Design a binder for this molecule. Structure first.
Ligand code: ZN
Length: 117
Protein backbone atom coordinates (compact mmCIF):
# COMPACT_ATOMS: atom_id res chain seq x y z
CA UNK A 1 0.00 0.00 0.00
CA UNK A 2 2.77 2.50 0.83
CA UNK A 3 4.01 4.05 -2.41
CA UNK A 4 7.66 3.05 -2.57
CA UNK A 5 6.78 -0.50 -1.46
CA UNK A 6 4.15 -0.83 -4.23
CA UNK A 7 6.56 0.56 -6.83
CA UNK A 8 9.34 -1.77 -5.67
CA UNK A 9 6.82 -4.61 -6.08
CA UNK A 10 5.77 -3.17 -9.45
CA UNK A 11 9.27 -3.16 -10.94
CA UNK A 12 9.63 -6.84 -10.01
CA UNK A 13 6.13 -7.45 -11.37
CA UNK A 14 7.15 -5.77 -14.60
CA UNK A 15 10.18 -8.05 -14.78
CA UNK A 16 8.20 -11.20 -14.16
CA UNK A 17 5.83 -10.17 -16.96
CA UNK A 18 8.87 -9.63 -19.09
CA UNK A 19 9.88 -13.25 -18.38
CA UNK A 20 6.31 -14.44 -19.01
CA UNK A 21 6.07 -12.57 -22.29
CA UNK A 22 9.58 -13.64 -23.28
CA UNK A 23 10.53 -9.98 -23.61
CA UNK A 24 13.80 -8.26 -22.62
CA UNK A 25 12.77 -4.57 -22.38
CA UNK A 26 9.55 -2.67 -21.44
CA UNK A 27 8.98 0.71 -23.12
CA UNK A 28 5.71 1.67 -21.41
CA UNK A 29 3.85 0.60 -18.25
CA UNK A 30 0.28 1.83 -17.80
CA UNK A 31 -1.45 1.36 -14.45
CA UNK A 32 -4.84 1.94 -12.97
CA UNK A 33 -5.09 3.59 -9.56
CA UNK A 34 -8.45 3.96 -7.89
CA UNK A 35 -10.15 7.32 -7.56
CA UNK A 36 -10.69 6.68 -3.79
CA UNK A 37 -7.50 4.74 -3.35
CA UNK A 38 -5.23 4.66 -0.32
CA UNK A 39 -2.43 5.79 -2.68
CA UNK A 40 -0.76 9.06 -3.67
CA UNK A 41 -0.25 9.50 -7.44
CA UNK A 42 2.26 12.30 -6.99
CA UNK A 43 4.61 10.11 -4.99
CA UNK A 44 3.77 7.12 -7.17
CA UNK A 45 5.23 8.74 -10.30
CA UNK A 46 8.30 9.94 -8.30
CA UNK A 47 8.88 6.47 -6.82
CA UNK A 48 8.53 4.97 -10.29
CA UNK A 49 11.43 7.11 -11.46
CA UNK A 50 13.41 6.26 -8.33
CA UNK A 51 13.08 2.44 -8.80
CA UNK A 52 13.01 2.05 -12.62
CA UNK A 53 16.73 2.83 -12.94
CA UNK A 54 17.44 -0.27 -10.82
CA UNK A 55 16.42 -2.48 -13.73
CA UNK A 56 17.33 -2.30 -17.46
CA UNK A 57 13.99 -3.85 -18.27
CA UNK A 58 11.99 -0.93 -16.76
CA UNK A 59 14.58 1.86 -17.03
CA UNK A 60 13.10 3.66 -20.03
CA UNK A 61 9.47 2.73 -19.40
CA UNK A 62 6.91 5.55 -19.74
CA UNK A 63 4.49 5.56 -16.82
CA UNK A 64 0.83 6.53 -17.37
CA UNK A 65 -2.02 6.38 -14.78
CA UNK A 66 -5.74 5.77 -15.39
CA UNK A 67 -8.13 6.72 -12.60
CA UNK A 68 -10.56 3.86 -11.81
CA UNK A 69 -13.88 3.56 -9.95
CA UNK A 70 -13.92 1.41 -6.83
CA UNK A 71 -15.54 -2.05 -6.57
CA UNK A 72 -17.14 -3.26 -3.31
CA UNK A 73 -17.87 -6.56 -1.61
CA UNK A 74 -20.20 -6.94 1.31
CA UNK A 75 -19.14 -9.09 4.27
CA UNK A 76 -21.21 -12.23 3.81
CA UNK A 77 -24.10 -10.96 1.67
CA UNK A 78 -23.61 -12.13 -1.93
CA UNK A 79 -23.08 -8.77 -3.55
CA UNK A 80 -19.90 -7.74 -5.37
CA UNK A 81 -20.63 -4.70 -7.53
CA UNK A 82 -19.51 -1.17 -8.45
CA UNK A 83 -21.52 1.47 -6.51
CA UNK A 84 -23.60 3.91 -8.57
CA UNK A 85 -24.48 6.64 -6.01
CA UNK A 86 -23.22 8.50 -2.91
CA UNK A 87 -23.99 5.24 -1.16
CA UNK A 88 -20.24 4.41 -1.24
CA UNK A 89 -19.12 2.47 1.85
CA UNK A 90 -22.22 0.26 2.26
CA UNK A 91 -23.71 -2.56 0.17
CA UNK A 92 -26.71 -1.67 -2.06
CA UNK A 93 -28.54 -5.06 -1.61
CA UNK A 94 -28.75 -4.24 2.07
CA UNK A 95 -27.05 -1.10 3.38
CA UNK A 96 -25.05 -3.05 5.85
CA UNK A 97 -21.96 -1.49 7.38
CA UNK A 98 -18.68 -3.41 7.00
CA UNK A 99 -18.26 -3.74 3.28
CA UNK A 100 -14.75 -3.78 1.82
CA UNK A 101 -13.20 -2.35 -1.31
CA UNK A 102 -11.92 -5.12 -3.55
CA UNK A 103 -10.58 -3.03 -6.38
CA UNK A 104 -9.75 0.64 -6.69
CA UNK A 105 -8.07 0.85 -3.27
CA UNK A 106 -4.63 -0.01 -4.52
CA UNK A 107 -2.79 0.02 -7.89
CA UNK A 108 -3.35 -2.45 -10.77
CA UNK A 109 -1.50 -3.06 -14.10
CA UNK A 110 -3.51 -2.47 -17.26
CA UNK A 111 -1.07 -2.87 -20.21
CA UNK A 112 2.64 -2.98 -21.05
CA UNK A 113 4.49 -2.08 -24.32
CA UNK A 114 7.35 -4.54 -24.72
CA UNK A 115 10.29 -5.54 -26.93
CA UNK A 116 10.73 -9.28 -27.70
CA UNK A 117 13.96 -11.07 -26.65
ZN1 ZN B 1 -24.78 -6.47 1.46
Amino acid sequence: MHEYSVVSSLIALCEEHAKKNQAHKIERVVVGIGERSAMDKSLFVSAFETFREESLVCKDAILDIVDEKVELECKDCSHVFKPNALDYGVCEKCHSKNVIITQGNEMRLLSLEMLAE
